[model samples]
Target: KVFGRCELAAAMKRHGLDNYRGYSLGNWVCAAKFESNFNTQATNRNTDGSTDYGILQINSRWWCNDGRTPGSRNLCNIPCSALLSSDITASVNCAKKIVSDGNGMNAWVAWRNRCKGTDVQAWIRGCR
Candidate 1:
């Protein structure tokens, strides 16, 4: 599903991304916007032979297992396809775990390149 900005914001908030790990809701919103354009079924293959899946683009190299990425840690202990669900619970939970794993939000290149040290509050302006 491709969500409207506020709709995604509301979902993120409802799922607890809002200010989770000291990152604002806008931070998650911005990363998701740039990472997958709010599309739940997004997928991108990395040069490192890993796949990024779902709205937040959770990576196969570490978090989720694709049964293909050679060195997958499967830290989230779920199949990579789980992240693609439109319900978004698995995706958000995977992202939440990754963020809290000590890298914070910096684990996502999209967040670092676009959301870090930037004001993204506007992304969630109409949400709450």
Candidate 2:
């Protein structure tokens, strides 16, 4: 388990993620809510048989080795399990790299479907 929305926001801000990588804190918060509900240990199986990891829900297909999948690019060079912890610094850092890849938050399908062009202030309302 991990802290709820407010605490997560504070930690994200403390880690320089509130507005990092040209993304708003609200966007990050909104993504987290839909992606993992702020649960660090969260994991979900994708339709492609790949798995998502941690709060940001990074994919095992390209980001990490979940053992169940092979040929993972693992650009982040960290285990999938590493993302499933309260220490979100690595996760956030990996997310930054993803964003810089010209994907922005588009790398996260949840962000595209849920937060894209939507008002996300509610995700960060009390935390700010």
Candidate 3:
């Protein structure tokens, strides 16, 4: 736990914390709370046996280019080409890119429409 958390912090440092400071902390906590309770080392085997890991719950096999042979050490924050390659940064960018792409207007509409009615489930399930 200590090692992974420290490594996450180190990754954050190498990647520019400011790019993430404004919105990421709370958003990450909220999303992870919804998904798996902020467990950086968590691994959830989907019903089909696929896996998700790290604080962002990144699907290592699919997203981590080098795979998870070395786990977080293999995927810690680093630049991937022109992209600033930190998992947290990548995760944030991916999510923002999707919302800003204007492709999921219906999802936005559903959130705006339905989120007000059920605060509890909406926060947990809806946020995810």
Candidate 4:
């Protein structure tokens, strides 16, 4: 069952995002689908959000409003449940902003972990 905009908005607000998009919902769903099937119980050994966690697959709970550690942050503050709850929009927006932040995705070189030219394919991979 597809969720509505208000549902998504509430989720984004939980994540400190007030302006997300419908398309972002699909992206969030897909990311969660690919990463953890939208499981809120997901926690990686390499990260408490160090690489990617939660529904929208956030990489670093600290990067968002979720504080630094899983031990310290709660759903009300970090709202990691947005990964599976109703905040799909914000989750995708978080990913979108990171991937588009010029230093994140736009500059392929910046994303490539190299000093060479931008790897257009890298951005394409993020889309995948």
- Candidate topping TM-score: 1
Relative to the true structure, candidate 1 reaches a TM of 0.96
CA-lDDT, candidates in order: 0.91, 0.85, 0.38, 0.41
Candidates sorted by lDDT, best first: 1, 2, 4, 3
On residues 46-94, what C-alpha lDDT tens digit does candidate 4 reach at each position? Answer: 4333434555445554334434445442323344445444435545555
User: Which of the two, 3 or 4, has more lDDT?
Assistant: 4
Task: State every prediction's TM-score relative to the real structure.
Answer: 0.96, 0.92, 0.37, 0.38
Considering TM-score, which of the candidate structures 3 and 4 is the better prediction for this target? Answer: 4
Pairs in steric clash, model 3: 78-85, 79-85
* 78: Cα error in model 4, Å: 6.0
lDDT, residue 29, model 2? 80
* Model 2 clash tally, residue pairs: 0
| lDDT by residue for model 1 (1-128), tens | 99889988889989999899888899998999999999999999999999999999999999999988998999999999989888889988889899998989888899899888888877888676
Give the Cα error of residue 47 in candidate 2, in Å: 2.2
**Which digits, one per residue and each the tens of the lDDT, describe model 2 over residues 1-128?**
66588888887788777677778888888898889988989999998888999989988888888888867788888899998988998788888777778878999899999998999778788675
Ranking by TM-score: 1, 2, 4, 3
Q: What is the lDDT of residue 65 in candidate 2?
A: 81
Model 2's lDDT to the true fold? 0.85
